[PDB]
Structure formats: C-alpha cells, structure tokens
Write a protein that binds this DNA or RNA. Structure first.
Ligand SMILES: *P(=O)(O)OC[C@@H](CO)CCn1cnc2c(=O)nc(N)[nH]c21
Ligand SMILES: [Mg+2]
Ligand SMILES: [Mg+2]
Ligand SMILES: [Mg+2]
Ligand SMILES: [Mg+2]
Ligand SMILES: [Zn+2]
Ligand SMILES: [Zn+2]
Lengths: 69, 174, 925, 155
RNA sequence: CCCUAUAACUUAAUCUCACAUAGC
RNA sequence: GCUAUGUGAGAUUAAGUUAU
C-alpha cells in the first residue's frame, strides 16, 4: 500500500520533469520537496496528503489532458 | 546437420567404410568440418546482427514514446491507488474544476479553485463551506473572469447564465 | 581555626576549608607524569595537598584557592630555595612557606595562593579525552570562565561540531585565557634561564590563570645557562590552541581584543617575518628549528613539524594572501597572467623555478599548463560575492549563475508488478523499499559545497603524530613504489571527462593521443620542479541512495591526473595486487575472498571481539595535516628515484591540486578549505592511510591514559613507559620500539582497511583494562583531531565471531555450510537489490529484454540471501531468477514474432539455475 | 616426373600465399595505423588552435591598465590571485539567498563592497527573469524566485 | 550542453599462445 | 615445413553491475 504511493510519486515527478516544471525554480523546489518526503515517509496516512499537492501541481497545468483518461 | 551435400558425401564415404577410401573420408571429413564451421560462423554473425538491430529498434522506440507512455502509466497506477482524496481532484479536473495553485496541507491557507459551471458549483458547494480533496474549506470570496468580487448570495439558479462562467474561489482550510 | 588563619598570612583574605579538620582532601585531577616506574597523561588521585576556598566580601565562593602542600622535610628547603630565585617573576604564583604544628610535630607546609580549581592539564585532558555523559570538568570550566552558562548545556548535542556549530564560539571564548597562559609560560622560561634553573615544565604545574608552581624536580645550575624542557607541555597543548583559537588576538592592533583588525596590504603574501615573530613570541623555548617555508625543510618529518606550526600561524593572516601567486609573462609581446608560485596555508611560500619572462611561442605543454591554470580564468572573470555559502568565493566566469538539478529515477513497472504478483511488498514485511533516486532542486550543488564549513584548521600533537607516522609506515612497507614512465601507465577509462577547461574540447583520449610519451615525461619533470594549480569541477551524482542528501563528485583536470598517475601508479597497483594485508583494496569478495579476508582479520587474537566505527563527514572534515601526512606516507616509496626537492614539489602539486584548489561549482570559482577530492587518483589509498593513522593514535591515547600502577602485566607497563619516552622525550626515530609497538598492535588490534571503512578484531580483555583502543578512545581522538562527534549509534561491536562483522562495505556476513566446511558469505540489504531492480537512471533500462545482462549481475550480487533464515530475504534471489526466465521467454516471443526465423539463443538456460550463481562463491575460480 | 613438378609449384604457391597474406595484413595494419596517426595529429592541431584562441580571447577580456597598476605597485611584480578580481574587476555579481541578506548587502541603487562603489545595473532571479528594484520588498519576497543575482558596475 | 577516481565481478566480440584431430 | 576443425589460457575493446 505504501510502495504503490512511492512508485506513483516517482512516476508523477518524472512526468512533471517531462512537462518542463523546472523552468520555474520555485515550483520545482516545491515538487522535489514533496517527492522526497513521500519516499522517506514512515506511514501512509500522511503520504497520501503530500500526493494530493504533488498531483495538483500537474492538474494546475494544462499540458496534459485527463479528459482522455 | 542434415542440410549439407557435404554431410551426404561424408556419410557416403563413412558408410563405404579399407585404407584407400579412409583417405577419401579423411579429406571429405576436413571438407565437411570447414563447411560446418563456416555455417556456424554465418549463424554466429547473423544472430549478432539480428540481436543488434533488435536492441537499437527497441531502444529508439522507448526514447520515442517515453512521454506518452509515462503519461499513460501515471493514471494507470493512480486509478489502482483507490483513494477518494485523489479521486475527488481527478474527477473534478475531468468535469473542468481545476485548482490554480498547490493544495496546501496546512490549515488556514489560501486555495484557488476554478468552477466553470453551475452543476459543478452545487455538487461541490452548499452553504459557506465547500468540499474539495476530501476536506472542508472556508470560502473567503469568489471573483469573476471580468474581475469583480461576487458574494455567495449573488450566484443562484436563474442568474447563473447572467454571470461570467469562470468563478475563482479563494478558500481557507478548516 | 588556628591553621586557617596561619594559611591567610600577611595578605588579608576570607577562607573556607574544603577538606575536613586539619587533614588533607583527595581530588581527582589529570597529571602529566613520567617516572622511572610510571608514565603517561592520566587521571590520578591527588593526596599531597589541602586546598582552601576563598570567598568575596559579598559572601559567594570565588575561583581563588589557597592550596597547602604537606610533603617531606627536604622538599621544603629545596622548593623554598628555588622560589627565592624566581620570586621576582610575575609568572610564578605567590608562595608562603611556614611550619605549623599538627600532632605535636612541626610539619612544613607550602601554601600556594590565589590558584584556580583546575590546572591546564585538566583542560587539555577534558578536551583531548572527551566523553559525553562524563564531561563535568569541561562543563565546570566553561561555566567558570563565562564561556557559556549552565543551561547552554541543557540543549541536546551542545558538544557536536556538526549539530551545533556554536560550540566553536563557546570554545573560542577560552582562546584569550589560553593565549595569556602561553605568554606566562614564556616569561617563566626566561626566568628559569636567567636564574640558571633546569627542569621539565608540565601542564599540571600551571593553573588556568597561567601561574606556575611545583619546583620539586628543579635543580640549580650556573646563572644564565638554564634549559627548561617544554616538548611535552607544548605538544600536549597543541590541539587546544586551534580548538580554542588562542591566537585570535594577534590579528588585532597591538594584540588587544577591543582594537580593530590589522589592515594588511592586499598585495602582500610573504608573511615570513610575521611567522618568525609569532614563533619567537609564543614558542621561544622550542628546540627544534622552525622553517616558515617548507621548501627549506630537511625531510618529511621536518615538513610535518613545520607545517603543524604553519597551520596555527596561518589563522592570523588574511585569506586573500593564500593561493596562486601570479606574475606578468610576455608571450609574443602580449602580456599574460600566469601563476608562477603558490602561498600555502601549510607549506609557506613556494616559488616556481622554471619561469620565463618572455616566450617566442608556446609548446603544447606550455599551452596545457596555461589552460589548466586558474590565473587566466580568474583574472578575466567578474568579481563574485556569494552569500549562499560561507566559503571564499573568487570569481564568476559566466555572466550567469548555473543551477543544475537532479532528475528523479525512472520506474521499472514490469519488475515491480511481477514482484508484487509473486507475493512481495506486503504489509508487515521485513523487506521494504528504501533506496530511491532522490531528486534535487537547483540550489543543491552549492549547498553541498557549504559542507566544507566542517573543515577547520587543526593543529596536531606533533610528537605523537611523528611517532604515529613511523608506525603507519610499517603497515605499508610490504609494497613497492616509485616513478614510472608514460608508457608504463595503465588507464582504466579513456572516454571519461578531462576536467575544466579541458572538457570543452574533448575527453581524456584526446589528451592522451595529442601528447607524445616525451611530452608526458616532460610534463612530469615540469611538475617535479614547479607547481601547477588546477581547477576541480563539482558535479552532482545521479545514483540510488537511502538518504535524501545530494552527493557531489569532484572532477580533477587531465594535467593533475596525468602527472599523479606517473607518480603514484606503481605503488597503487602494488597495494591492489597484494593479498592478506591490512589494506584490502583490490581483493574480490567472490570465490571465497570474503572468507579469506575474515580469517585474515581474525588472525590469532586471544580474547577476540569485533568492532567497527564510523567517520562522520569524512571527506569534508578531514584535516589538512592528516592529508599531508597521507601524501608523505605514499611518497616515502620514492627514496631512490627522487631527490628531496623533487618530492617537495610533488607534495606541493598534490596540495595545490587536490587539497586547496580552485573549485568550479556552477560557472563560479571558489577556494576549497581542504578535505579529500573523490576525483583524485589516490583518494581511496589516502583514506586508508588516514584510517590506519586514526586507529594507531587511538591506541596510543588509550595506552597512555591508563594508570601505570594498575597495569598488572610487566611487558605492557614497560611498553607504556617506552611509549611515553619515544613520543615526548626522544627526538629521533627508535626503529626497534616502532617494530615492537607494531608487533603489539598486530597481535592485539588486528584491522581490515578499505578506504574510509574498516573492521578491527581486538583483544577484549586488553580493551576492558585500557591496553588497546575502544569506542570511547576513537570518539575522543575524532573529537580533538577530526573536529567531529562520532556518535555510538553508527558504531557497532560483535562479541560472537560465529557471526561476522555487523557491516563491512555495506555487506552483512553469514556463516553457511558450503560443501563439507563452514565459510563466511557476504550478503547485501534486500531493499538495495530490490531498489536497483524497481528504479533505474535511464528509460532504456526499463525494458528487460534489452537488459537481461543487468538482472544477471543483480542476481549474482543477491545469491547469498538464499542461506538466510528469513524466508522473505531468501525469496528475493528466486524472484530475480524467475524474472530472468520471463525476460528470456519474452525475448524469444518478440524476436520470433517480428523476425520469422527463430533465434537459437545458445547458453542462456544457465542464467535461471542457481549453479551459475553458486559457483561465484566457491573458492575454485 | 610431373607430380613432383606440381609439388614444387604448390610449395612455391604456399610460400608466396603465406607472404601474400602477411603482406596484405601488413598493408592493412599500416594503413589503419596511419589513419590513427593522421587523425591524431589533426586532433592535436585542433586542440592547439582551440586552447590558443581561448587564451587569446581571455587576455583581451582583462582590463590591463587597472591590472598593471596593482602589479607595478607590487614589490616584485608578483601578487596573489585572490585580489585580482577583488581590485581590477569591472563587474560584480552578488548571489543573495533571501531578503534579510538583500537589505543588508545591496539596498538601493548603489552599495559598497570590497572598498569600492558599485552601481547596480540589473537584477535577475533564479529563472533568469529581469526583476525590478521596486519589486524586491519584504512583502513581495514570497513571490520572488530566490536567489537573486545582482550584477553591478564599478563606480 | 555536464556526468570523477579506484577496485572487483558478469556478458559480448576480437587477437595471440598451448593442446588434440585430419590432409599435403 | 604448411593447411583446416575443436578444446583451454592470456591480452585488447565494448556493454553492464556492485563497493568506496
Ligand atoms: P564512503 O562512501 O563512505 O566514503 C566516504 C568518502 C567520502 O565521500 C570518501 C570515499 N570516496 C572518495 N572518493 C569517492 C568517490 O568518487 N565515490 C565514492 N562513492 N566514494 C568516494
Ligand atoms: Mg605538580
Ligand atoms: Mg611536584
Ligand atoms: Mg563515511
Ligand atoms: Mg562507508
Ligand atoms: Zn622544517
Ligand atoms: Zn619518484
């Protein structure tokens, strides 16, 4: 249950790296901070909490279309 | 192996087997030996070239389709995760309700959501609090695409075509 | 009461008897002792004296003490006579001699007045033998002399130099007091010389106000010809001088802490007469000759002795004076700026010999050393002030600042869902995922560079370092070394980087093909006579880890690498080739090498336990004296092929290239304070020399800090006596005692060394009596010599040798039955093996049909997990086997369905049967 | 006797064929080693030209008259390298991590560092976008992409 | 466009050496 | 003296893995 969260975190951060988030340094710093915390988290109650923030970074961009999915 | 005429010649020279065609089967054995060695060399370098073109083809396919395969893989395991907090913000982004900034984990922090139609408003908001990302949030205001501040009594059933449809809700966490 | 007023004397003071009655009191103090029977710097019980507390007229107890000495009758006449020849000096304390009736007999008393509670020996012992939870003397001194009040101590890890860098300020509050003591000692030595008095000065005869007493062993001689021995005093005090920063007042006007700083000329770099004046003021009675520039030293022992004084005196001088010394050079009638010298913090001023004011043209070698020079890059770049770091920033080369990030790892989904279909990654499992690629933001490279604030200038105990370097040399005497020509050089990789600025034009193959063998030999002969400063480039490393800290790797340029290969390769190859030694670099763990290494490290120890320690911030905080020591140990193999000035210029090139070089970090040049550069060719070997040095000085400090009366064994007591003699009394190398102490260490402290990681098998009975080093001795030694706090959560011990070492090179050890005998096999963390499989640094590694060769190596590395009692650990190896077979079947299917002729796929069924992996750990190669 | 005649002839062709193989291989290794050597000396000429033009532009980048003054004021014409950009650099770049460092280090259009007057020319952020001096404020500090890089000129 | 050093092991492909076999 | 077939050893190159 925890491992699926960590692997989805690394997949989400590599998607955000593909979408050129690091051209803005502040958003990329927030994304890396969220990604590192999920990996080192010792409980899955607060690892889903950071996952909402990291997924919302992607959802706030319109480079992807999730209407297709 | 059986696909040689030199194998048939060497097998004929061996089934004829005293010492005078022994010389014949010896030179025909050297013939069949160098022939089978050359066939092994051809099979060797053919396997080499086939696996090399396989490596480069699959590698260039990976490098070509990395971004679409990564975007497809992400919503495969997000769907597998089975989280209503994650499913709330995915279905809302499906029907058009996308945030403008990061959802804050902390309480009493600003949140900028966009609601584009009235059913999305009424299926999210009821009263002065509205539910998003499996949490209760405090409406501070809601502003327009034409940049004027609207209070909650102004938007309703009948005058929702009257106002401009991008409604940007500023929200603080409970 | 009649004894209390007798002690007050003519001077008026209020007293309170610390001891009861007219009897004496026992105190537990530290003494620097040396007798015919006992020696060492240990804590003994003091029974001779009786001390009286003084209190102010507002009635609280103050630091002044009245300590009376009840001794024999003939000591009274002798002490009184010596005191009357030194009474005029302001360095001596006040002595009031009298006789007072105790039990009907008149007993002579020597009352020493206005003393502190603790001596200088108590401070030096409390800082050189630091143990948290047993540090009450240091806390009492720090509370007493206003360095910090008592609730500063309440804060957790107040002593840690890494978790609390304010402890340097707290310790530097004692610097002014220590400096005053040194001045008083010089005054007392001048008074002893003028009064014709000879004698040894020790730390326990001087209190923390700097006043002197205890003229017990002093003997009179012709006035004007008195020699006082201060070797032990100064050398025991030497780490405290930089830990408390005693000479910080010397950078002010008139040496006063209220005055502003001295404003030196910015063009000035020499500071030779200033170093001589500092030595003449503070260490006037030090018999050994001091050379401010180490180009004039006589051997490597003199180089170490003079560099130890240079690291103290260089803290006074401004930091813009150190580094490359540049001059105007005219090539083609056009002026250049090239570096024709170097001013070292440790080696003084070094001047290049082969300079030419005017050059008609530039040879490929001249272009190569002018391009590698930081002078042209820094003299044309912009001025840089970087407030992100505390380290000294030189120049910005680019108009922009580069911010490089670390990408996240690529996820191998097929191996992960194959693993979770096989039953892995359940809840409550002993196998977790803990090794991931951690991403880094743009501020990561310069925040990694700000860990060089953990490097501090460190003066060493020079006598024990000189003895320790001789013992360390014995460990490396089996190997053979020396210089080799350019055609004998073996380069592992020629398509790696060439460093800055050589990475702009190509790889290392370009510079090994563009340069002839004559050119490389001419460049090596040029470095034997000149100093070429180079630029090291810092690059973030994209590798899997269990910690979210970024890791940088230093990239040394091709000039320094090319010359250091010819200097060091014969010795480095020799160390790797040797088997069964202490340093185990080059020994494979496969084919029974782990079992042979473990059998070798156990050797023949009578009461064997196992022990392994840690170096916190090892490359960052390694002091420059130990790095120069390691370079001199590795350079001692050049006795036949090199002269002394050739070896000095090779040492200076090593210092200017990998110790204090200009570091390019994002298009910006910085000054590196010191430490070890990973990119350097000899980094692994030098870390082994450093590890052996720290273990040997831990044994030396363990054997001298024990009570020599409590040592029952006569051999160990005589060894302790000769150890103190060869450290502090003898000035020349006693090779017989160095061989005897090395034999004692090989018998009782057996070590296995690989870079900065080491495991030691030792006699636990000798450790429980203090005769060999332990964890506490290592923590104390790393405290006063490495400026780090080694916690006990990172060290381990092992009392049962049927289990191996707890961890070595991040491998555990199990005793398993192979064939008819029991062997030791290494096994890794299963999270590490699983992590490599589930995450990769390339999208090409995410399919398995191209990367069956990758999972075979992971399976080979994870084979000994099958002998584990944990079923989950055992299951990890099988999972890799079944995945390799699945990759084989998918490769067969895809290569058949795309190309209609079937691949025969020969000799591939060996990869999923465990005999191919069982053969990697059986001894027959 | 013609069987021994083609025996002698076949021994002669075996000799000349072995010499044929070794001399063709010899021309092969000679031509590929002269390929290696010719392309390697072309590499050497290219690296010589590249390092030479790098040093030749780098000499022209440094302002000499401010440099020859501090070199001629030296007692031997030898100075430390750490003072050359400290005293002769026209531009200064300051990397500032937050606002508390900014208001101390460079507040205003002109600040003082290293015994010189520096006139601020341009400020960029970590995204290298031009930041106005009016934008750098205590209340606008969470909107800036820190660090800021301030390039100045010597006044 | 940047990506260090050293050590060990695995796989692949070449080139020499030794041995066994058969012809001139 | 030569030619061809296999079996092992060493060297060179390429790719990968682990450790520090
Ligand atoms: P280890 O990782 O615990 O070693 C400590 C270390 C300092 O970083 C020194 C060892 N070292 C030196 N150079 C190195 C390098 O290029 N790579 C690695 N992994 N370790 C190095
Ligand atoms: Mg004494
Ligand atoms: Mg005494
Ligand atoms: Mg370490
Ligand atoms: Mg380690
Ligand atoms: Zn010397
Ligand atoms: Zn030499």
């Amino acid at each position: 249950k925890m491992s699926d969260v960590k692997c989805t975190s690394v997949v989400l951060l590599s998607v955000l790296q593909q979408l050129r988030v690091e051209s803005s340094s502040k958003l990329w710093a927030q994304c890396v901070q969220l990604h590192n915390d999920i990996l080192l988290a010792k409980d899955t109650t607060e690892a889903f909490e950071k996952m909402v923030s990291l997924l919302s970074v992607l959802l706030s961009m319109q480079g992807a279309v999730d209407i297709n999915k | 192996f059986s696909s040689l005429p030199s194998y048939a010649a060497f097998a004929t020279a061996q089934e004829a087997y005293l010492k005078k065609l022994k010389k014949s089967l010896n030179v025909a054995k050297s013939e069949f030996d160098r022939d089978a060695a050359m066939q092994r060399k051809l099979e060797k370098m053919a396997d080499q070239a086939m696996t090399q073109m396989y490596k480069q083809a699959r590698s260039e396919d990976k490098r070509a389709k990395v971004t679409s395969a990564m975007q497809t893989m992400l919503f495969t395991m997000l769907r597998k995760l089975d989280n209503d907090a994650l499913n709330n913000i995915i279905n809302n982004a499906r029907d058009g309700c996308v945030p403008l900034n990061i959802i804050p984990l902390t309480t009493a922090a600003k949140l900028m959501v966009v609601i584009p139609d009235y059913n999305t408003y009424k299926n999210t908001c009821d009263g002065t609090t509205f539910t998003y990302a499996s949490a209760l949030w405090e409406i501070q205001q809601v502003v327009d695409a034409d940049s004027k501040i609207v209070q909650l009594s102004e938007i309703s059933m009948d005058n929702s075509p009257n106002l401009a449809w991008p409604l940007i809700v500023t929200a603080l966490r409970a | 009461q009649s004894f209390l007023n007798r002690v007050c004397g003519v001077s008026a003071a209020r007293l309170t008897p610390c001891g009861t009655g007219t009897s004496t009191d026992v105190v537990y103090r530290a003494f620097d002792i040396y007798n015919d029977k006992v020696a060492g710097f240990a804590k003994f019980l003091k029974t001779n004296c009786c001390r009286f507390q003084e209190k102010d007229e507002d009635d609280n107890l103050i630091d002044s003490y009245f300590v009376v000495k009840r001794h024999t009758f003939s000591n009274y006449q002798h002490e009184e006579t010596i005191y009357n020849l030194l009474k005029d000096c302001p360095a001596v304390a006040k002595h009031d001699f009298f006789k007072f009736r105790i039990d009907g007999d008149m007993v002579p008393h020597i009352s020493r007045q206005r003393l502190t509670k603790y001596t200088m020996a108590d401070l030096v012992y409390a800082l050189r033998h630091f143990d948290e939870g047993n540090c009450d003397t240091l806390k009492e001194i720090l509370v007493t002399y206003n360095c910090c009040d008592d609730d500063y101590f309440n804060k957790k890890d107040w002593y840690d130099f890494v978790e609390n860098p304010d402890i340097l300020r707290v310790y530097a509050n004692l610097g002014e007091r220590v400096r005053q003591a040194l001045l008083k000692t010089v005054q007392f030595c001048d008074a002893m010389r003028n009064a014709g008095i000879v004698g040894v000065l020790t730390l326990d005869n001087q209190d923390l106000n700097g006043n002197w007493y205890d003229f017990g062993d002093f003997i009179q001689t012709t006035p004007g010809s008195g020699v006082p021995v201060v070797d032990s005093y100064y050398s025991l005090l030497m780490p405290i001088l930089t830990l408390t920063r005693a000479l910080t007042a010397e950078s002010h006007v008139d040496t006063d802490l209220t005055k502003p700083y001295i404003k030196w000329d910015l063009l000035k770099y020499d500071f030779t007469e200033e170093r001589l004046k500092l030595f003449d003021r503070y260490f006037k009675y030090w018999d050994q000759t001091y050379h401010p520039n180490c180009v004039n030293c006589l051997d490597d022992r003199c180089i170490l002795h003079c560099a130890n004084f240079n690291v103290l005196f260089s803290t006074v001088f401004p930091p813009t004076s150190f580094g490359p010394l540049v001059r105007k050079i005219f090539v083609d009638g056009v002026p250049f700026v090239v570096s024709t010298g170097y001013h070292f913090r440790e080696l003084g001023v070094v001047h290049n010999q082969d300079v030419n004011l005017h050059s008609s043209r530039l040879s490929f070698k001249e272009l190569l050393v002018y391009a590698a020079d930081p002078a042209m890059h820094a003299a044309s770049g912009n001025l840089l002030l970087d407030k992100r770091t505390t380290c000294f920033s030189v120049a910005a080369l680019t108009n922009n600042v580069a911010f490089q990030t670390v990408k996240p790892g690529n996820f191998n989904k097929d191996f992960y869902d194959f693993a979770v279909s096989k039953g892995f990654f359940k809840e409550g499992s002993s196998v977790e995922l803990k090794h991931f690629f951690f991403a880094q933001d743009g501020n990561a490279a310069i925040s990694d560079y700000d860990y060089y604030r953990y490097n501090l200038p460190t003066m060493c105990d020079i006598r024990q370092l000189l003895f320790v370097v001789e013992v360390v040399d014995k460990y490396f005497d089996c190997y053979d070394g020396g210089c080799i020509n350019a055609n004998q050089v073996i380069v592992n990789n020629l398509d790696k980087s060439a460093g800055f600025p050589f990475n702009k034009w190509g790889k290392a193959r370009l510079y090994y093909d563009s340069m002839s063998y004559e050119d490389q030999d001419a460049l090596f002969a040029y470095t034997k006579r000149n100093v070429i400063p180079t630029i090291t480039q810092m690059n973030l490393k994209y590798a899997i880890s269990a910690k979210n800290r970024a890791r940088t790797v230093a990239g040394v340029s091709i000039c320094s690498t090319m010359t250091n290969r010819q200097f060091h390769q014969k010795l480095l190859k020799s160390i790797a080739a040797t088997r069964g030694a202490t340093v185990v670099i080059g020994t494979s763990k496969f084919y029974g090498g782990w079992h042979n290494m473990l059998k070798t490290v156990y050797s023949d120890v009578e009461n064997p336990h196992l022990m392994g320690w840690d170096y916190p911030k090892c490359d960052r905080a390694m002091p420059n004296m130990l790095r120069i020591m390691a370079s001199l140990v590795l350079a001692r193999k050049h006795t036949t092929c090199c002269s002394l000035s050739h070896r000095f210029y090779r040492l200076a090139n090593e210092c200017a290239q990998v110790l204090s070089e200009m570091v390019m970090c994002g298009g910006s040049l910085y000054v590196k304070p010191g430490g070890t550069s990973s990119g350097d060719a000899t980094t692994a070997y030098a870390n082994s020399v450093f590890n052996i040095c720290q273990a040997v000085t831990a044994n030396v400090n363990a054997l001298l800090s024990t009570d020599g009366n409590k040592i029952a064994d006569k051999y160990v007591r005589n060894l302790q006596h000769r150890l103190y003699e060869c450290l502090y009394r003898n000035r020349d190398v006693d090779t017989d005692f160095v061989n005897e102490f090395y034999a004692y260490l090989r018998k009782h402290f057996s070590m296995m060394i690989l870079s900065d990681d080491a495991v030691v098998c030792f006699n636990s009975t000798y450790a429980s009596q203090g005769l060999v080093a332990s964890i506490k001795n290592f923590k104390s030694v790393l405290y006063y010599q490495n400026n780090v706090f080694m916690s006990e959560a990172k060290c381990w011990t092992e009392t049962d040798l049927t289990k191996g070492p707890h961890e070595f090179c991040s491998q555990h050890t199990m005793l398993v039955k192979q064939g008819d005998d029991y062997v030791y096999l290494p096994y890794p963390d299963p999270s590490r093996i699983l992590g490599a499989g589930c995450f990769v640094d390339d999208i090409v590694k995410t399919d398995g049909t191209l990367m069956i060769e990758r999972f075979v190596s992971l399976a080979i590395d994870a084979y000994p997990l099958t002998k584990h009692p944990n079923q989950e650990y055992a299951d990890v190896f099988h999972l890799y086997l079944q995945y390799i077979r699945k990759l084989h079947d998918e490769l067969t299917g895809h290569m058949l369905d795309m190309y209609s002729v079937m691949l025969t796929n020969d000799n591939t069924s060996r990869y999923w049967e465990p005999e191919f992996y069982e053969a990697m750990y059986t001894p027959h190669t």
